[PDB]
């Protein structure tokens, strides 16, 4: 594992994300776990105390490599960094909670850029799912609107991104 300079004096979730980014030199702070893409989960129950902790750490890497949520991925990676650097233990829910706040306080920070990318991603998944549920409805809309079917999916995603991830009628 690469060493994180002063990971122990980081005061905010945004500053932690930015530290991992500069020291690994990777687009997003979870690319380093790519080997664990689609790894089977591990049942830690019954194992020795030591084995159980190692399995929880491996299962957290599987989450950072696999989760369908950018917010889960970012928080998992931050979890792993805090554990390796012996930072005070906080759960993945606490991490997400703290960076949900730091993004509302300043949407331009690293937390905020992360939330924006999570909303945009959720909006795209919502759009694809809706499309695949109402294939004929999307096609009817493309015909009438004089556009392609994918351009219709894109309009849904534009709408959903404007309202925190989910479609709402304007």
DSSP annotation string for 36-47: GTTPPP---TTS
d(CA 120, CA 111): 14
SS3 48: coil
| Burial class of residue 111 in the structure, from the number of CB atoms within 10 Å of its CB (0-12 exposed, 13-18 middle, 19+ buried) | buried
Query: Cα–Cα distance between 68 and 126 in angstroms, integer?
Result: 12
Boundaries of every domain in the chain: 7-105, 120-162
Number of Cβ within 10 Å of residue 110's Cβ equals 22
Solved using: X-ray
d(CA 109, CA 99): 10
- CA triple 28-1-77, angle to 5 deg: 35
Mark residue 122 as left, alpha or beta (left: phi above 0; alpha: psi -120 to 50; beta: remaining): alpha
Q: Which helix (H) or strand (E) holds 129?
A: helix 110-133
Cα distance from N-terminal residue to C-terminal residue, the chain: 49
In sequence order, which residues have a C-beta less than 8 Å from that of residue 96 and are 6 or more positions away?
71, 72, 75
Angle CA 31–36–42, to nearest 5 = 140
């Amino acid at each position: 594992i690469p060493v994180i300079p002063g990971i122990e004096g980081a005061i905010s979730k945004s500053e932690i994300i930015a530290l991992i980014q500069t020291t690994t030199g990777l687009e997003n702070i979870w690319e380093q776990y790519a080997a664990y893409e689609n790894a089977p989960r591990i049942d830690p129950t019954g194992l020795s105390e030591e084995a159980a902790a190692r399995a929880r750490m491996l299962n957290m890497m599987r989450q950072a490599a696999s989760s369908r949520s950018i917010l889960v991925r970012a928080a998992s990676a931050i979890f792993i960094a805090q554990q390796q650097a012996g930072l005070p233990f906080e759960t993945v829910k606490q991490i997400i909670d703290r960076l949900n706040a730091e993004a509302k306080a300043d949407p331009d920070s690293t937390a905020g850029q992360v939330r924006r990318d999570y909303v945009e991603q959720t909006a795209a998944q919502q759009a694809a799912a809706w499309t695949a549920r109402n294939l004929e409805w999307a096609t009817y809309l493309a015909k009438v609107r004089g556009i392609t079917v994918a351009e219709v999916t894109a309009a849904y995603a534009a709408n959903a991104a404007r309202h925190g991830g989910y479609y709402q009628f304007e």
